[PDB]
Design a protein around this ligand. Structure first.
Ligand code: ATP
Ligand code: ADP
Ligand code: BEF
Ligand code: MG
Ligand code: MG
Lengths: 370, 387, 172, 362, 151, 168
């Protein structure tokens, strides 16, 4: 067995290769206390990690060590990996290879320090660093398609044909569920309700995860919510009081299809997918159009597969069929795909091994993992 | 349990224990003692390690133990550890009060006299047995067969030894040790496996290669045939799973390991192996009795159990009378009747024979060395026990 | 061969579970009998041996003085795990808090529960806790005089780097 | 005819026996263990292992009325296992006195003695003595020239058929005095002391299987040349009334069973039971009991995702390796009565080298 | 040294193929006459074009034994010559009408023709092998594996 | 490839599937040992007659069989000395891996290029219809594998010729 540790920017998703689904899913958060620690003894800790922080958050400054899929704070990222292996999986990491992941078009130094900490702190016996939108394509049961992965921090497209990636046609967009959370705070502020702190940012994430949905036709949905009760509904806070919301429920997800709302100049996710298909060689485009693959938690909004199929069918030539593949387990497909990969018998030849790291130094990942 | 004499084959690799008239050992366990150790290995609350752990208690838990052997070559190397086997044997396997009991012990045919003395002293002065007898291990294996002639060869964990017998007379000038047995084949199996890169040099791994040898090894009947299967073919290869869960592939080491009983030079001994040792022993007996020895060679002891050993040994004596008595003339070979006795029970024949002998002499109280006789003559009380 | 305790040669020393309540030089309150102030008690031995004994990976235990030395050798690794980046004035207080916080005794959560005898009675558990808290308070205080030897505001790296090292791959 | 798959064993199952209550069965895995399986509602569960043999177990059998199991192995031992009142099994070593492996064992119909075939050119007929509490072996050895591949007893306790690798099927008297009543004067003979020979019938290939008719008045046996032969004896020293050989178009039979006085099921390397029918005028292959003789989208599971990639990686391509059309996927090693009155088998069972244990109803 | 001196060959005499298969009753000159009368019937059946009646008559007797290679080879020469002179579309009409005894004589000798390609054309024997096994089933090869070694 | 080998490989497939009717068998000459009896040959009554299947004087199979073992040995096409070297070496890689192709010998029988030993244990623990499919799919493809290697040898003979000759 080998660990598969998809340290995403919003959730760590971890477990064992060939296991059905990730067994350690928790916030990619380190919390530190912000108040007068008056009661002596009491089992107090200098910092808290994951669900241990999320449940204590009313006294903590929660901060994610990872932003837009790039590690910003290594002293806390080691704290998350240590929590993953010793507290959440309860293994010794020196006994198991780890398949890690990262998004494409990351800094070189991210990939180096992430191999160095696995070999020099966690003492791991072998490791590998897969591209997240390649893994999501194993989890679809395919060898050609265009994975749209979108998580908490990054959205990216990787077009693949016959198992060859077309790396010139990879699109990264630094917009995903954390920007939709920050935008939901900016529009909730307009109805009556103020959310400000790093802990209140989790309450509005827990709104976004169950009140929001994607409108199939935003400009007509906007007129319908401005003229009826049916689109409005309510959520009950930790403080027992009720929050009622309406056109905020679909204006939030719409930022993915209209990044101009949060001040970005870019294509939306629909036109970013088409700009990746139209960068590919002309003979493969039909087999990409019939195999768009949704992945990552930001693709979980009710109606996003219907909307994505509508917007791509308007951009694509009407002569040919579009399919969006969106399984119900697309919430974890990058982990699911790493759990396939780390169990394929040729894969056991591809690991960076401890001995090979010791001899080659941390630059070995650049001449073995892609 | 029983009121009759207790009997104890304190072998080099296994203790076997029970009473007179037992048809099979009442208990048997590795003759091992262990002390607690920690070793960059798994630990568990499933078991509690006491300061001295022995027999089955150690062998079932040996990942946690510094395993040590009180015996080598059939002699006690460390009496402080043999005391910790004998305490266990009497007080928590048999569950006995030894005060005034009579016990039959065993030892091989050419031991240091200081070993029998300190073994009897311990029986009279730790435990306080009321009577002791010590029998030569291979003459016991002849009572198991219900037999009174024919050369008996015993191969154990520690020593291989031979005792010619004719018409109930024991030929003390012809008894012999080959200092190669089931442990030298095990140290050799570790040394063959080290050529493949598998290392077994922890003290607790020795019982794992004993279990591996005991499971997978066989004696080649025709060396150029097994060297053909070994070098030309995959058919010998076998996968063994260690208690660690590691799997190790073993191949020529299946026949090439127990071959050291037939070729002691593979383990650095200059002595002749079983076939040539039994032949040079029978062929040293007087002209009138040699027929009655070849007509009844008796195998005994656990290291006689290798698959093919009875057939290899019979062939390799027909093959050797042919070289050394017929000078390669085929005309007389069919007249040479050699027979090997290789009964199903033979691993335990020393115990099963001891349990027969301890019935034959249970009531004859002068036949044993009594505690009352030990405490007046000391070591000279053991001169009762034959030449 | 790793380095065993000198005190395994000592006899008729008091015992709890099968820890040895060895003579101790200290100011802390508890049941340990006073040592000679001029002699190496088990804590000067345990601190002297720790930096060598945590590199070995195979350690046979001779008796209750080694079961005591192992608990000390494991608790030094907890202290060096704590101490990184502290001023001595903070380290004293943090490592006394570590020494005094509620811990599992052998026979209760304890890692080496296979090798240490549980307390003989409900009363033996208290004499064990009041010993091990006195032992590990003194062990923390003594260790800090070594790790902050030459400079008082930065733990000497020659002591702090064993914070990743882990006696026989066990920890508390 | 219908097939029901009772259990899938993890290892090859050369032999099995169901107890007389059909509630539990013993079977020989291809190691020194013997498994015991019990009912679990409609399923079967592993109850215990026997493990008293040194080397691979070769055959096993379970006495109907007296409830004792008997076992053979390449270690040259046999054990008889008998139920203690507390619910566990008392092992007992039988001194077979064999120079080479034990291959194949059967309890006699009165269950007072059992016969063991060997590679040693001999058959050890074993019986028990209340005078000694021993099991003691008599060696049939005069005509046997090679390994004994199978045995079957006549429905009277005396006569033993044996199939031997010297391409012949023997009929021997196994009368042992002070166990058997006198044998009745019958088609095979009347002057009938131990090891007297009633036939040395020929075959084209090794005789894998033998069995007497339910009336005892004919013998059937089966060759590695893929033929079944039925021998109809006349009297001692006299040629048979008929020696009908039917040659199959299939791979060899390994096991054989008279369904009634006029029909036989046979099975082996063809992966399927077949039915033969006839009488002393002639015999023919008449049916295959397996419908496999005729050679007869939604969501996708994680284990189908993982296995379609492991198939592309380990094998040529994603596509699954197909089943055989037969119920068994490997040679069917043994074929045994299950239900109906003696001499009208209504159902039988088989166990395979694939580890299937299967119930067949006619 | 002694380890290599075989004794089993001189103290435990093994079985012989004539213990396992019954020895031929007909004498060497009695079969050499019986074959030498049939080969001219087979050679004649080719010369009159009725080659299929050539095979039916040639296959009515078979020579076997370690004493008769100099006429087993002549019988095989005539058999391979007759097989090379039957039209491939007539084969399924011949094979379906052969007894299981005649089929087991055909396929037994095609495996003797396939053993000597430097004297026999394999291409026509492999064609007969496909057709005889497809029509009469796999057991007809198993009866060759099991057959007498001096056939 | 197939269409020229089709008559031959249907004869080999049919012989080899009729030959693979194996069984457990403890040896008659040695006690408590099983041995692959086709490979030892010491007891003759449990050997079956050795059958040759053959397209040509060059291309042949020898099939030897016994109650618990089949040995199968092949000569493949070698029509020039480049195919003699390329075949002789390619088979030494293919037999050098015999511990992982479980049915291979580590040496051929004398006068054969490669040889297989399918023992009883393989027909109990591997799919025996996929064993003959591997033997046959090897005999179809090996002529295409070797002919392709003599193209790559010509391709390098050009690489070194152009690279030497173009720097005058
Ligand atoms: N089937 C077997 N195959 C191989 N070795 C065996 C077998 N059975 C037992 N042995 C070996 O026999 C030895 C134990 O036999 P035994 O009890 O007769 O020795 P012992 O009496 O303790 O030794 P000794 O007589 O020299 O003091 C061990 O080495 C064991 O591995
Ligand atoms: N049901 C949902 N509806 C909308 N957003 C969701 C839903 N489930 C998860 N998310 C969002 O998905 C993000 C986490 O997705 P994930 O794929 O695990 O990201 P990452 O890999 O970067 O950690 C968070 O912003 C979370 O709120
Ligand atoms: F880091 Be997550 F994939 F946005
Ligand atoms: Mg992600
Ligand atoms: Mg002994």
């Amino acid at each position: 067995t080998a660990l598969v540790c998809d340290n995403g920017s919003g959730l760590v998703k971890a477990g064992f290769a060939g296991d059905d689904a990730p067994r350690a899913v928790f916030p990619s958060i380190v919390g530190r206390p912000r108040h007068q620690g008056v009661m002596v003894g009491m089992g107090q800790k200098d910092s808290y990690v994951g669900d241990e922080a999320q449940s204590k958050r009313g006294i903590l400054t929660l901060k994610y060590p990872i932003e837009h899929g790039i590690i910003t704070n290594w002293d806390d990222m080691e704290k998350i990996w240590h929590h993953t292996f010793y507290n959440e999986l309860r293994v010794a990491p020196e006994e198991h290879p780890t398949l890690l992941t990262e998004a494409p078009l990351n800094p070189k130094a991210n990939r180096e320090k992430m191999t160095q900490i696995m070999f020099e702190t966690f003492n791991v016996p072998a490791m590998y660093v897969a591209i997240q939108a390649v893994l999501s394509l194993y989890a679809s049961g395919r060898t050609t398609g265009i994975v749209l992965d979108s998580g908490d921090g990054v959205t990216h497209n990787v077009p693949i044909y016959e198992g060859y990636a077309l790396p010139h046609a990879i699109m990264r967009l630094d917009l995903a569920g954390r920007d939709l959370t920050d935008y939901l705070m900016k529009i909730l502020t307009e109805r009556g309700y103020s959310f400000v702190t790093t802990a209140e940012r989790e309450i509005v994430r827990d709104i976004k995860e169950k009140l929001c949905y994607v409108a199939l036709d935003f400009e007509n949905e906007m007129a319908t919510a401005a003229s009826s009760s049916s689109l409005e509904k309510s959520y009950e806070l930790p403080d027992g009081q009720v929050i009622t919301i309406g056109n905020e429920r679909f204006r939030c997800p719409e930022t993915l299809f209209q990044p101009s709302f949060i001040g970005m100049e870019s294509a939306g996710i629909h036109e970013t997918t088409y700009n990746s298909i139209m960068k590919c060689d002309i003979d493969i485009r039909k087999d990409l159009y019939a195999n768009n693959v949704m992945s990552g938690g930001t693709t979980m909004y009710p109606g996003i597969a219907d909307r994505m199929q509508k917007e791509i069918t308007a951009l694509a030539p009407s002569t040919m069929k579009i399919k969006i593949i969106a399984p119900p387990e697309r919430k974890y497909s990058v982990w699911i795909g790493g759990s396939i990969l780390a169990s394929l018998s040729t894969f056991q030849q591809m690991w960076i091994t401890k001995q090979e790291y010791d001899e080659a130094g941390p630059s070995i990942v650049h001449r073995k993992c892609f | 349990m029983e009121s009759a004499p207790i009997v104890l084959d304190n072998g080099t690799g296994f203790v076997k224990v029970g009473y007179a008239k037992d048809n099979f050992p009442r208990f048997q366990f590795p003759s091992i003692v262990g002390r607690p150790i920690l070793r960059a290995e798994e630990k568990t609350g499933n078991v509690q390690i006491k300061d001295v752990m022995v027999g089955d208690e150690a062998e079932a838990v040996r990942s946690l133990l510094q395993v040590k052997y009180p015996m080598e070559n059939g002699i006690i190397r460390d009496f402080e550890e043999m005391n910790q086997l004998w305490d266990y044997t009497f007080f928590e396997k048999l569950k006995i009060d030894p005060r005034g009991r009579k016990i039959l012990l065993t030892e091989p045919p050419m031991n240091p006299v200081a070993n029998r003395e300190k073994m009897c002293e311990t029986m009279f002065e730790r435990y306080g047995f009321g009577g002791v007898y010590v029998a030569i291990q291979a003459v016991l294996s002849l009572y198991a067969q219900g037999l009174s002639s024919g050369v008996v060869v015993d191969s154990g964990d520690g020593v291989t030894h031979i005792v010619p017998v004719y018409e109930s007379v024991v030929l003390n000038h012809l008894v012999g040790r080959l200092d190669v047995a089931g442990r030298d084949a095990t140290r050799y199996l570790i040394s063959l496996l080290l050529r493949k890169g598998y290392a077994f040099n922890r003290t607790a791994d020795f019982e794992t290669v004993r279990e591996m040898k005991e499971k997978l090894c066989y004696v080649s009947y025709d060396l150029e045939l097994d060297h053909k299967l070994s070098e030309e073919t995959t058919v010998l290869m076998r996968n063994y799973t260690l208690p660690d869960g590691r799997v190790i592939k073993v191949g020529s080491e299946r026949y090439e390991c127990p071959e050291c009983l037939f070729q002691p030079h593979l383990v650095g001994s200059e002595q002749p192996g079983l076939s040539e040792f039994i032949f040079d022993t029978i062929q040293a007996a007087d002209v009138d009795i040699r027929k009655y020895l070849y007509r009844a060679i008796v195998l005994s002891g656990g290291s006689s159990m290798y698959a093919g050993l009875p057939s290899r040994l019979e062939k390799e004596i027909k093959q050797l009378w042919f070289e050394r008595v017929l000078h390669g003339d085929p005309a007389r070979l069919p007249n040479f009747k050699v027979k090997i006795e290789d009964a199903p029970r033979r691993r335990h024949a020393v115990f099963i024979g001891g349990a027969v002998l301890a019935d034959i002499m249970a009531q004859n109280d002068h036949m044993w060395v009594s505690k009352a006789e030990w405490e007046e003559y000391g070591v000279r009380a053991l001169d009762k026990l034959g030449p | 061969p790793a380095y065993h305790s000198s005190f395994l040669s000592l006899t008729d020393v008091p015992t709890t579970g099968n820890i040895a309540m060895l003579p101790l030089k200290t100011k802390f309150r508890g049941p340990a009998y006073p040592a000679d102030e001029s002699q190496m008690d088990i804590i000067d031995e345990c601190i002297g041996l720790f930096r060598a004994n945590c590199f070995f990976r195979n350690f046979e235990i001779k008796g209750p003085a080694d079961r005591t030395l192992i608990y000390g050798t494991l608790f030094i690794s907890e202290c060096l795990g704590r101490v990184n980046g502290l001023n001595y004035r903070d380290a004293e207080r943090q490592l006394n808090s570590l020494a005094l916080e509620n811990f599992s005794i052998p026979g209760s959560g304890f890692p080496l529960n296979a090798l240490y005898a549980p307390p003989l009675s409900p009363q033996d558990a208290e004499i064990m806790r009041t010993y091990l808290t006195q032992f590990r308070q003194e062990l923390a205080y003594r260790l800090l005089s070594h790790v902050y030897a030459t400079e008082k505001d930065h733990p000497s790296k020659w002591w702090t780097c064993f914070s990743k090292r882990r006696f026989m791959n066990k920890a508390l | 005819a219908t097939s029901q798959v009772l259990h899938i064993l993890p290892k090859p199952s050369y032999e099995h026996a169901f107890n007389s209550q059909r509630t539990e069965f013993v079977t020989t895995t291809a190691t020194n263990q013997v498994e015991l399986y019990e009912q679990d509602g409609n399923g079967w569960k592993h109850a215990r292992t026997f493990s008293d043999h040194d080397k691979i177990v070769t055959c096993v059998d379970w006495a109907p009325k007296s409830n004792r199991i008997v076992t053979c192995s390449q270690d040259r031992n046999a054990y008889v296992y008998e139920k203690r009142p507390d619910g566990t099994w008392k092992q007992t070593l039988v001194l077979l006195r064999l120079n080479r492996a034990a291959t194949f064992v059967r309890w006699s119909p009165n269950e007072d003695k059992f016969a063991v075939g060997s590679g040693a050119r001999v058959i050890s007929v074993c019986y028990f003595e209340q005078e000694n509490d021993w099991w003691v072996s008599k060696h049939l050895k005069r005509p046997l020239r090679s390994t004994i591949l199978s045995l079957d007893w006549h429905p009277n306790n005396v006569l033993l058929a044996a199939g031997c690798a010297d391409r012949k099927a023997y009929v021997l008297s196994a009368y042992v005095r002070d166990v058997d009543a006198k044998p009745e004067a019958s088609v095979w003979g009347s002057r009938l002391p131990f090891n007297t020979v009633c036939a040395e019938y020929p075959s084209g290939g090794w005789v894998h299987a033998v069995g007497f008719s339910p009336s005892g008045n004919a013998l059937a046996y089966a060759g590695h040349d893929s033929s079944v032969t039925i021998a109809y004896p006349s009297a001692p020293e006299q040629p048979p009334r008929a020696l009908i050989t039917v040659k199959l178009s299939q791979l060899p039979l390994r096991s054989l069973l008279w369904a009634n006085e006029s029909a036989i099921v046979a099975a082996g390397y063809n992966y399927s039971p077949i039915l033969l029918q006839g009488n002393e005028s002639g015999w023919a292959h008449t049916r295959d009991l397996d419908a496999g003789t005729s050679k007869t989208e939604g969501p996708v599971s994680f284990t189908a995702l993982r296995s379609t990639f492991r198939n592309m990686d380990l094998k040529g391509s994603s596509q699954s390796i197909s089943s055989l059309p037969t119920v068994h996927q490997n040679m069917i090693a043994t074929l045994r009565p299950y239900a109906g009155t003696p001499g009208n088998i209504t159902a039988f069972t088989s166990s395979g080298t694939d580890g299937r244990v299967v119930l067949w109803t006619l | 040294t002694f380890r290599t001196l075989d004794v089993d060959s001189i103290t435990e005499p093994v079985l012989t193929e004539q213990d396992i298969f019954p020895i031929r009753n007909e004498t060497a000159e009695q079969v050499q006459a019986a074959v030498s009368q049939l080969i001219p019937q087979a050679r004649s059946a080719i010369q009159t074009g009725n080659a299929l009646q050539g095979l039916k008559t040639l296959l009515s007797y078979v020579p076997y034994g370690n004493d008769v290679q100099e006429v087993r080879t002549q019988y095989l020469n005539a058999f391979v010559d007759v097989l090379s002179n039957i039209r491939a579309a007539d084969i399924p009409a011949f094979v379906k009408e052969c007894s299981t005894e005649e089929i087991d004589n055909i396929v037994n000798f095609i495996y003797r023709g396939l053993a000597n390609p430097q004297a026999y054309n394999s291409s026509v024997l492999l064609n007969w092998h496909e057709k005889v096994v497809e029509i009469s089933g796999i057991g007809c090869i198993v009866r060759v594996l099991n057959s007498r070694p001096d056939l | 490839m197939s269409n020229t080998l089709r008559p031959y490989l249907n004869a080999v497939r049919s012989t080899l599937t009729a030959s693979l009717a194996l069984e457990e068998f403890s040896s008659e000459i040695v006690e408590r040992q099983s041995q692959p009896e086709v490979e030892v040959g010491r007891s003759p009554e449990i050997l079956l007659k050795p059958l040759v299947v053959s397209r040509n004087e060059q291309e042949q199979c020898l099939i030897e069989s016994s109650v618990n073992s089949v040995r199968f040995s092949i000569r493949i096409k070698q029509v020039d000395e480049i195919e003699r070297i390329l075949v002789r070496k390619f088979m030494q890689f293919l037999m050098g891996r015999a511990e992982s192709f479980f049915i291979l010998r580590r040496k051929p029988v004398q006068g054969y290029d490669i040889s297989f030993l399918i023992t009883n244990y393989h027909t109990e623990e591997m799919l025996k219809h996929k064993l003959v499919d591997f033997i046959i799919e090897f005999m179809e493809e090996v002529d295409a594998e070797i002919s392709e290697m003599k193209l790559f040898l010509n391709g390098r003979a050009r690489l070194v010729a152009e690279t030497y000759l173009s720097c005058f």
